[PDB]
Enzyme design. Structure first.
Site, PDB file in Angstrom:
ATOM      1  CD  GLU A  35      -3.136  -0.463   0.120  1.00 31.40           C
ATOM      2  OE1 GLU A  35      -3.055   0.678  -0.390  1.00 31.40           O
ATOM      3  OE2 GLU A  35      -4.028  -1.279  -0.202  1.00 31.40           O
ATOM      4  CG  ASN A  46      -7.995   7.501  -4.595  1.00 33.75           C
ATOM      5  OD1 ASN A  46      -7.121   6.719  -4.957  1.00 33.75           O
ATOM      6  ND2 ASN A  46      -8.264   7.730  -3.313  1.00 33.75           N
ATOM      7  CG  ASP A  48     -13.202   9.311  -5.236  1.00 34.14           C
ATOM      8  OD1 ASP A  48     -11.997   9.594  -5.090  1.00 34.14           O
ATOM      9  OD2 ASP A  48     -13.862   8.713  -4.363  1.00 34.14           O
ATOM     10  CB  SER A  50     -11.223  10.438  -1.873  1.00 32.99           C
ATOM     11  OG  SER A  50     -10.944   9.288  -2.651  1.00 32.99           O
ATOM     12  CG  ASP A  52      -6.114   6.140  -1.138  1.00 33.61           C
ATOM     13  OD1 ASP A  52      -7.285   6.338  -0.754  1.00 33.61           O
ATOM     14  OD2 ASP A  52      -5.841   5.587  -2.220  1.00 33.61           O
ATOM     15  CG  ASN A  59     -10.665   7.080   0.243  1.00 32.62           C
ATOM     16  OD1 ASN A  59     -11.777   7.572   0.403  1.00 32.62           O
ATOM     17  ND2 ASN A  59      -9.954   7.272  -0.856  1.00 32.62           N
TER      18      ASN A  59
END
Length: 129
Positions: A35, A46, A48, A50, A52, A59
Protein backbone atom coordinates in the site's frame (compact mmCIF):
# COMPACT_ATOMS: atom_id res chain seq x y z
CA UNK A 1 9.34 7.55 8.31
CA UNK A 2 10.21 4.49 6.23
CA UNK A 3 9.84 1.41 8.42
CA UNK A 4 11.93 -1.73 8.13
CA UNK A 5 9.96 -4.95 7.63
CA UNK A 6 10.61 -6.38 11.11
CA UNK A 7 10.49 -2.98 12.78
CA UNK A 8 6.96 -2.44 11.44
CA UNK A 9 5.90 -5.98 12.39
CA UNK A 10 6.94 -5.33 15.99
CA UNK A 11 5.15 -1.97 16.12
CA UNK A 12 1.94 -3.44 14.68
CA UNK A 13 2.05 -6.37 17.10
CA UNK A 14 2.49 -4.03 20.07
CA UNK A 15 -0.53 -2.06 18.88
CA UNK A 16 -2.67 -5.20 18.85
CA UNK A 17 -2.98 -6.01 15.15
CA UNK A 18 -1.71 -9.60 15.37
CA UNK A 19 -4.75 -11.81 14.80
CA UNK A 20 -7.05 -8.79 15.07
CA UNK A 21 -10.40 -10.00 13.68
CA UNK A 22 -8.64 -13.19 12.61
CA UNK A 23 -5.94 -11.62 10.42
CA UNK A 24 -2.43 -12.75 11.28
CA UNK A 25 0.35 -10.17 11.55
CA UNK A 26 1.71 -11.26 8.18
CA UNK A 27 -1.42 -9.91 6.48
CA UNK A 28 -0.98 -6.41 7.94
CA UNK A 29 2.73 -6.16 7.10
CA UNK A 30 2.02 -7.42 3.57
CA UNK A 31 -0.73 -4.81 3.11
CA UNK A 32 1.48 -1.96 4.35
CA UNK A 33 4.29 -3.12 2.06
CA UNK A 34 2.15 -2.95 -1.06
CA UNK A 35 0.00 0.00 0.00
CA UNK A 36 2.79 2.43 0.94
CA UNK A 37 6.06 0.49 0.75
CA UNK A 38 6.33 1.02 4.52
CA UNK A 39 6.41 4.83 4.11
CA UNK A 40 4.26 6.67 6.67
CA UNK A 41 4.18 9.77 4.46
CA UNK A 42 2.77 8.14 1.33
CA UNK A 43 -0.19 9.93 -0.27
CA UNK A 44 -2.15 9.14 -3.43
CA UNK A 45 -5.04 11.02 -4.99
CA UNK A 46 -7.95 9.12 -6.53
CA UNK A 47 -10.10 10.03 -9.54
CA UNK A 48 -13.12 10.73 -7.35
CA UNK A 49 -11.16 13.50 -5.63
CA UNK A 50 -10.45 11.65 -2.39
CA UNK A 51 -6.90 10.89 -1.24
CA UNK A 52 -5.29 7.88 0.49
CA UNK A 53 -3.01 8.52 3.46
CA UNK A 54 -0.27 6.79 5.38
CA UNK A 55 1.28 3.40 5.72
CA UNK A 56 -2.10 1.72 5.16
CA UNK A 57 -3.39 4.27 2.64
CA UNK A 58 -6.60 5.16 4.45
CA UNK A 59 -9.13 7.02 2.27
CA UNK A 60 -10.51 10.51 3.00
CA UNK A 61 -13.96 9.85 1.56
CA UNK A 62 -14.96 7.86 4.65
CA UNK A 63 -12.28 7.69 7.32
CA UNK A 64 -10.49 10.97 7.88
CA UNK A 65 -10.90 14.67 7.14
CA UNK A 66 -8.53 16.47 4.75
CA UNK A 67 -10.76 19.47 4.09
CA UNK A 68 -11.01 18.84 0.36
CA UNK A 69 -13.24 15.79 -0.13
CA UNK A 70 -16.82 17.17 -0.55
CA UNK A 71 -19.56 15.35 1.34
CA UNK A 72 -17.18 12.79 2.81
CA UNK A 73 -17.32 11.25 6.27
CA UNK A 74 -14.74 11.24 9.04
CA UNK A 75 -15.51 7.91 10.70
CA UNK A 76 -12.15 7.70 12.45
CA UNK A 77 -12.62 11.28 13.72
CA UNK A 78 -9.15 12.55 12.84
CA UNK A 79 -7.45 14.86 10.36
CA UNK A 80 -5.90 12.76 7.56
CA UNK A 81 -2.50 14.34 8.32
CA UNK A 82 -2.43 12.48 11.64
CA UNK A 83 -2.12 9.32 9.51
CA UNK A 84 1.24 10.42 8.10
CA UNK A 85 2.98 10.58 11.47
CA UNK A 86 6.00 8.40 12.27
CA UNK A 87 3.88 7.16 15.20
CA UNK A 88 1.53 4.58 13.64
CA UNK A 89 -1.02 4.67 16.48
CA UNK A 90 -3.65 6.71 14.60
CA UNK A 91 -3.28 4.59 11.48
CA UNK A 92 -3.64 1.41 13.53
CA UNK A 93 -6.67 2.58 15.49
CA UNK A 94 -8.42 3.62 12.28
CA UNK A 95 -7.45 0.39 10.49
CA UNK A 96 -9.11 -1.54 13.31
CA UNK A 97 -12.39 0.27 12.65
CA UNK A 98 -12.08 -0.32 8.93
CA UNK A 99 -11.40 -4.06 9.17
CA UNK A 100 -14.26 -4.46 11.67
CA UNK A 101 -16.59 -3.43 8.86
CA UNK A 102 -18.34 -6.25 7.00
CA UNK A 103 -15.68 -6.53 4.27
CA UNK A 104 -12.58 -7.04 6.41
CA UNK A 105 -9.19 -6.59 4.78
CA UNK A 106 -10.74 -6.72 1.30
CA UNK A 107 -11.10 -2.98 1.94
CA UNK A 108 -7.43 -2.67 0.92
CA UNK A 109 -7.01 -3.25 -2.81
CA UNK A 110 -3.31 -4.07 -2.40
CA UNK A 111 -4.10 -6.74 0.18
CA UNK A 112 -6.79 -8.32 -1.96
CA UNK A 113 -4.65 -8.37 -5.10
CA UNK A 114 -1.19 -9.00 -3.68
CA UNK A 115 -1.51 -10.61 -0.24
CA UNK A 116 -4.76 -12.56 -0.05
CA UNK A 117 -4.12 -16.24 -0.68
CA UNK A 118 -0.33 -15.97 -0.57
CA UNK A 119 2.14 -17.11 2.07
CA UNK A 120 1.75 -13.95 4.16
CA UNK A 121 3.79 -15.39 7.02
CA UNK A 122 6.86 -14.91 4.85
CA UNK A 123 6.48 -11.24 5.75
CA UNK A 124 7.37 -11.72 9.42
CA UNK A 125 9.85 -14.61 9.20
CA UNK A 126 13.27 -13.82 10.61
CA UNK A 127 11.82 -11.17 12.89
CA UNK A 128 12.17 -11.06 16.65
CA UNK A 129 8.60 -10.80 17.95
Amino acid sequence: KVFGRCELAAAMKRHGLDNYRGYSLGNWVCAAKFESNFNTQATNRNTDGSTDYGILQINSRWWCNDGRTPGSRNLCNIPCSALLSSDITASVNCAKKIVSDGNGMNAWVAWRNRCKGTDVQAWIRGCRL
